[PDB]
Amino acid sequence: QGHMDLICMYVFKGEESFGESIDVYGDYLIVKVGTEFLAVPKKSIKSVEDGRIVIGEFDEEEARELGRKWLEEKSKPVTLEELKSYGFGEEGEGS
C-alpha cells in the first residue's frame, strides 16, 4: 500500500509541471516553485500519483501570501509531525 518516490513527489497543476513537494503543514502542501513556496490547499490536490501530485485549481495569490506566512512561522524548531503522512492514496494513475 502507498506509492514510490516519497522523497519528492512532482506537483503537476493538472497536466502542466507546477513544482515539487518540499514540506506539508496543516491543510497546506508547501510546493517549491521557482524561488518561492506556494502553499496549495488540500482541496486543490486531486490524486496522489506514483511519485507525483496532481493538483487542480486554487487561489494562487492567497497560497503565495500564506506561503510566505509559513516562511515566517517555520523559524520554530522541527517538531511538526503532521508532515509525516503515509500516502494512503492506493488509487492514482494505476492500481
List keywords for this structure.
monomer; about 100 residues; alpha+beta; Ubiquitin-like (UB roll); 6 strands; globular; DUF5749
Overview of the molecule:
Pfam families: DUF5749. InterPro entries: DUF5749. It is classed as structural genomics, unknown function. Keywords: protein of unknown function, Structural Genomics, PSI-2, Protein Structure Initiative, Unknown function. The assembly is monomeric. The chain is an alpha+beta fold. It has a single domain, classed as Ubiquitin-like (UB roll) (Roll). 15% of the residues lie in helices and 37% in strands. It is built from one helix and six strands, in the order E-E-E-E-E-E-H. It has a six-stranded mixed sheet with strand order 4-3-2-1-6-5. A hairpin with a 2-residue loop joins strand 2 and strand 3.
**Approximately what portion of the residues adopt beta-strand conformation?**
35-45%
Straight-line N-to-C gap = 10 Å
The first-level CATH class name: Alpha Beta
Strand order of the largest sheet: 4-3-2-1-6-5
| Structural class by SSE content | alpha+beta
Number of domains: 1
Shape: globular
Main sheet: strands, sense, barrel: 6 strands, mixed
Number of helices: 1
Please tally the β strands and state the result. Answer: 6
InterPro entries: DUF5749
Pfam family, one: DUF5749
PDB class: structural genomics, unknown function
Keywords: protein of unknown function, Structural Genomics, PSI-2, Protein Structure Initiative, Northeast Structural Genomics Consortium, nesg, Unknown function
